[PDB]
């Protein structure tokens, strides 16, 4: 039995002074409470709208540890159903993607329509002489599904704020990648799936608040990798200014630049394409977001992405000491086939399971998780003090709470959000606590 009553989350996190206790990456009751309160209420990434273009097309994904199917309706809308039959909880769909007209349970034979209604129970008059009400036994539907510029977000709860109110100011930085051109964006060529033996909070924290690690972890890649013109040297060497936004658990960070240059890893054709479309990008977005082609972003809890490389990642928790990585390569829908092939090659070469840069990150997370087994290795305080007390609001058109790029405002905000969600019942209390914390951080 799991009883959160004797748990005290607030004693393991100190966001005021910047300390953390590493037990949170190992405790299993913590993981069960997470599955109940974090992934049960927050918006989660389902799929891109370009993977279910026509009616009856489906896609098999996860929402936490739960299997979910996302299917495009007959009128144009999109629905998501818990992938579980109502008779012995058998799995109704097994493929990755495709077109279907009905989901048929392989165990007994109950059949459901693509809108979740029960349309065929074999031998109903004999097996159910008193009558079966087919309306109550439809598939379990996700009550909240909403699309944002091509990305579909689902939520199990109904008292949560809408997708726009939940995203808040991170939409301003996400539009910089979604809204570069006319015609939206689209996914190119499949999904990469693998497993890393680490708690799900490590990659979230790194992609929300760590650009610092790139100075020393990826030094070999910088030495070795850096035939059209790519970036001469890594941006942090020549950058004039920098910015990191951290708020409500969402994080973003990048370096200011004078010309549309991506990082050194990208192939030449990608950089040429970005230079070509800089004019349109500036026309739509502005000067700051059109020159932003290198950085890191993260939407709480598990939606990470990078700007220049055009890579998107989703982090599925599997227990308190594992995570599964889903990786997408997303480009602009108005590009050509050769540019799309170049984008695919660059993204899969740089950030795959065998890419020059993911190697070290995965190794380090696994090492931390291995070290955390002992009793004294998970009861010793750590340091979250980078850039503490230097938070300010800009007034030149960039919104939110800001700091220098080498700081940990985003990680502290994420941990405060996580501890506030775990320790509160209703979403209103979460909002009130977050508002109080954001009032405190500025004074």
């Amino acid at each position: 039995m799991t009883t959160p009553s004797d748990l005290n989350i607030y004693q393991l996190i100190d966001t005021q002074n910047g300390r953390v206790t590493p037990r949170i990456y190992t405790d299993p009751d913590i993981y069960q409470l997470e599955l109940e309160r974090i992934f049960g209420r927050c918006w989660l990434f389902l799929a891109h709208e370009s993977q279910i273009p026509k009616p009856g097309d489906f896609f098999n994904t996860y929402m936490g540890e739960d299997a979910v199917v996302v299917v495009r309706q007959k009128d144009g809308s999109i629905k998501a159903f818990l992938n579980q039959c109502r008779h012995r909880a058998m799995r109704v769909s097994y493929a990755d993607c495709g077109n279907t007209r009905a989901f048929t349970c392989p165990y007994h034979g109950w059949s459901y329509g693509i809108n979740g209604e029960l349309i065929d129970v074999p031998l109903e008059p004999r097996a159910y002489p008193q009558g079966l009400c087919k309306s109550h036994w439809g598939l379990n539907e996700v009550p909240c599904v909403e699309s944002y510029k091509g990305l579909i977000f689902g939520n199990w709860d109904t008292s949560a704020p809408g997708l726009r109110d939940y995203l808040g100011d991170i939409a301003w930085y996400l539009d910089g990648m979604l809204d570069r051109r006319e015609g939206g964006t689209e996914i190119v060529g499949g999904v990469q799936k693998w497993v890393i033996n680490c708690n799900w909070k490590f990659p979230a924290e790194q992609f929300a608040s760590d650009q610092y690690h790139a100075l020393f972890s990826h030094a070999s890649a910088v030495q070795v990798l850096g035939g059209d013109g790519q970036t001469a040297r890594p941006v942090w060497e020549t950058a004039k200014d920098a910015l990191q936004f951290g708020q409500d658990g969402h994080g973003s960070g990048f370096f200011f630049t004078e010309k549309p240059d991506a990082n050194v890893w990208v192939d030449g054709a990608v950089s040429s394409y970005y230079r070509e479309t800089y004019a349109e990008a500036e026309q739509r977005l502005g000067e700051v977001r059109a020159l932003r082609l290198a950085g890191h972003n993260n939407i709480f809890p598990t939606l990470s992405w990078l700007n220049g490389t055009a890579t998107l990642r989703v982090w599925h928790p599997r227990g308190p000491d594992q995570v599964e990585v889903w990786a997408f390569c997303i480009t602009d829908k108005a590009a050509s086939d050769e540019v799309k092939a170049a984008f695919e090659n660059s993204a899969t070469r740089a950030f795959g399971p065998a890419g020059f840069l993911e190697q070290d990150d995965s190794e380090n997370w696994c090492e931390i998780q291995k070290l955390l087994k002992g009793h004294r290795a998970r009861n010793s305080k750590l340091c979250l003090e980078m850039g503490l007390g230097q938070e300010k609001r800009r007034d030149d058109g960039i919104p939110g709470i800001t700091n220098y790029i080498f700081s940990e405002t985003a990680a502290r905000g994420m941990y405060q959000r996580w501890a506030d969600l775990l320790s509160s019942e209703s979403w209103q209390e979460v909002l009130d606590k977050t508002a109080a914390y954001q009032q405190e951080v500025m004074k």
Partner: protein
Amino acid sequence: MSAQVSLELHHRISQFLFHEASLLDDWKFRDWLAQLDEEIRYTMRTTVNAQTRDRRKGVQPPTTWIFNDTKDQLERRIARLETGMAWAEEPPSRTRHLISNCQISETDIPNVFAVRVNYLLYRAQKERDETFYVGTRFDKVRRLEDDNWRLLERDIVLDQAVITSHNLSVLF
């Protein structure tokens, strides 16, 4: 069937593949690199589960790349290893290659042969880390005028839909 090679040709090609695997195992990366041809193409794709109707029609869900390397790309990975700053390979992993089911067939191109083998790659890392990769490999070998062979192409198939190792830092 295809016009198969004689006994001696099979012996020579099998010995060449054995020696390449030994070079990869003995941590002689520069020599292994010198064993490859200039126009090498070193690819690997993902694996997906399709619907029964899709399987019958011949339709498959979209795939992607895991390896897409020329010779310079492999050189560049080796040079990354040689710097000593590759934290993913410190300490280096110990790997063993088992090559079986060697099938050798000719090709219409003169003096270029096609090879299909099954491979088991055992990768053991520090302090109780083990991983098994099992699959098939379609290689091509070119015979030079100096009685020596060069790897002209290599295609690798990994039978895991969801790879269970956090990275693939070792060459197949």
